[PDB]
Ligand SMILES: [Cl-]
């Protein structure tokens with residue numbers, strides 16, 4: 001799943017991608033990528049593969065569902081002329097159903113989620129070298145917890161789109177499940193959703209492994 | 215030079231180590247370790263070796279020379295009953311000679327630096343499983359630059375103290391020199407001294423390699 005030298009990699013998502021990145025566009029120099037997994041991906045590429053000249057860009061936005069991502073996709077993502085795009089999205093699409101159950105217009109149901117991911121992949125894939133779908137995740141080891149069960153269904157929908165569109169799927173949730181057998185969720189996040197540096201390192205390493213750097 | 219499971223590792227130094235860590239003592243939970251190499255060391259230990267149960271602690275203090283470290287050693291470092299101690303120090307000892315050349319009581323010359331390091335190792339080694347000396351560094355590839363030449367001399371004084379006491383020496387400066395052949399210093403720091411995340415990852419990986427994790 002190699003990243004060609006001299007390429008621009010645009011990483012898209014919600015707050016976990018955002019991590020305080022610069023506006024309108026987060027770039028590597030200084031701290032413009034924020035302080036989470038996107039900044040860690042860039043740091044590993046520059047420290048281990050500086051000659052690859054990979055330009056990493058962050059356009060994550062806190063609170064986004066896949067509907068928000070789709071609305072801004074051409075202007076915020078494709079206008080940057082990416083060679084590679086990654087997308088992690090879905091935790092908010094599910095979370096709103098639990099933290100705002102009566103505020104139904106904030107919810108994105110699974111059919112809208114799957115259809116919107118399919119459209120984004122279908123329009124993006126012909127214009128990039130590769131697109132990477134990164135699973136949303138929820139740091140709850142009990143897969144019968146209702147929200148965890150719903151997140152797993154959305155992850156499956158993403159996996160199915162990745163398979164049907166033939167783009168790579170990075171199962172970040174599976175990496176957390178392995179780690180949660182050793183560490184309890186409070187070590188990784190204050191709220192099962194937004195990880196500390198440790199969980200951002202899990203995401204970055206999963207992505208870097210998917211692109212053959214680790 | 216492995217770290218035995220269930221051990222407390224206290225990391226000491228100047229702002230490079232500090233990185234906004236919590237007072238009076240920086241601990242892992244949340245962001246108490248700051249947002250630099252000490253936090254990255256802890257993150258890798260917990261993600262890759264959670265069963266090791268390594269408690270990482272940060273007592274770095276911005277602006278410290280080795281004289282400042284020695285003054286607070288017993289109360290800030292040894293009182294924590296460390297199993298392992300790391301120390302990176304020296305860049306300020308040198309830098310003050312250049313940024314405040316006439317303010318001589320802020321300078322620490324090489325004989326004082328060497329003798330103070332000797333004393334810190336001598337007093338610590340019998341009380342810990344292992345101590346690690348981490349080179350200070352200066353992100354200037356021209357070895358003839360006067361400050362870079364002086365930093366190199368202090369690094370070699372530290373290396374010689376480590377060899378005399380038979381404690382591990384981690385040559386962080388050498389890892390930066392290799393990377394500086396590929397990336398210019400402005401990619402790594404705004405001032406040749408305080409690195410961005412990329413440089414903190416260089417330091418963390420050098421430490422982790424020295425303890426057998428990478
Ligand atoms: Cl495992």
Ligand SMILES: [Cl-]
Nearest residue numbers: 392393395396
């Ligand atoms: Cl090399």
